[PDB]
Symmetry: D2
Subunit: 64 residues, 4 copies
C-alpha cells in the first residue's frame, strides 16, 4: 500500500521536462535496495527453516 511519491511517479509532464530518466534511475536504486532486503530475508528464512528441519528430524528419530 506504500504508494509512489511524486518523485517516483513518472508522468508525461515529467517527460516534457526531461526528468523521466532521472526518476527512472531513482526507481533503480530503490528497486535494487529492495532486492537486497528481500534477499536478506531469504537467507534468514532459509536459516530458520533449516533449524525446524533439525528439530523435526531429531524427533522422528526419537520414535525410532
Amino acid at each position: 500500500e506504500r504508494k509512489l511519491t511524486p518523485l517516483e511517479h513518472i508522468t508525461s509532464l515529467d517527460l516534457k521536462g526531461g526528468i523521466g530518466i532521472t526518476e527512472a534511475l531513482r526507481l533503480q536504486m530503490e528497486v535494487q535496495k529492495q532486492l537486497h532486503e528481500q534477499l536478506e530475508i531469504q537467507r534468514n528464512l532459509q536459516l530458520r527453516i533449516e533449524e525446524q528441519g533439525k528439530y523435526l528430524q531429531m524427533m522422528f528419530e526419537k520414535q525410532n
Copy 2:
C-alpha cells in the same frame, strides 16, 4: 535440541518474514511497473 517453545517462535518468525517479503515484493513490483511505462513512453516515442 531446541525446545518445543523455540520451535514455535521460529514458526511465528517464519510466517511474519514471509508476510514481509510479500509486502516488499508488492512495493518492488509497483516500482518495476513505473519503469515499464517509462520505457514504453520512450519506445512509443521512438516509433513516432
Copy 3:
C-alpha cells in the same frame, strides 16, 4: 549497449518472475501453516 527492445524484454521478464515468486511464496506459506498447526497440536498435547 542493449537495445530498447531488449530493455523491454528484460522488463517483461522481471514482471513475470515477480509474479512467479508471489505464487511460489503463496504455496510455501500455505505449507508453513501446516507445520504450524502440527507443532501446535503437539504443543497443545504437551500441556494436557
Copy 4:
C-alpha cells in the same frame, strides 16, 4: 491455488495414527525446495535488474 494434497494435509486422524511427524518432514523437503527456487529467481531478478541499470545509466550520460 496449488492446494495441499492429503499427503501434505496433517489431520487429527493422521496424528492418531502417528504419521503427523512424517507428513511434517514431507512439508520440510517441499518448503526447502521452494526456498531454493525462490532464491534462484532472486539471483535472476538481481541480474536482470542490474542490466536495466546499465542501460538507463548509459542513456542518462548520453544526455550529458
